[PDB]
Amino acid sequence: PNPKAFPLADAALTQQILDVVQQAANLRQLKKGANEATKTLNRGISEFIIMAADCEPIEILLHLPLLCEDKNVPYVFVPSRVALGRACGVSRPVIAASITTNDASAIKTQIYAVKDKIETLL
């Protein structure tokens, strides 16, 4: 894992996150791609940004943590772009994805738990 891919989830929190991602795909509460993710942030509709630690060169993602801090949106890195893209429901790598808001789903409540876990990593 690239040391700039911080905070970084373990394999267990990773599976949890990817499960939430796959729920979001099914609910159509998911945007894939770094620029697609940026756009959700600037609209104020992201609930969670997930990035891949094995994105090379990782520099192309590094504006995203800063944007998320500006917008008060949680983010995390998972170790593998291949696994992230599987979770997103596509057969290609995904280096960043964004869960978007929906007031009638359980996603926000799961993200709240995930945030607590990420904060325990810190």
């Binding site: 911080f6 905070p7 801090e69 008060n72 949680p74 983010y75 990420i118 904060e119 810190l122």
Partner: peptide, 27 residues
């Protein structure tokens, strides 16, 4: 390398202040 250690440190501080469920307590 020292660049990356500082990046991590600053990311930690800003996650606690700007994003955390318990950010008031971290503030």
């Amino acid at each position: 390398d020292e660049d990356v250690k500082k990046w991590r440190e600053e990311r930690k501080k800003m996650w606690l202040l700007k994003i955390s469920n318990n950010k008031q307590k971290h503030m």
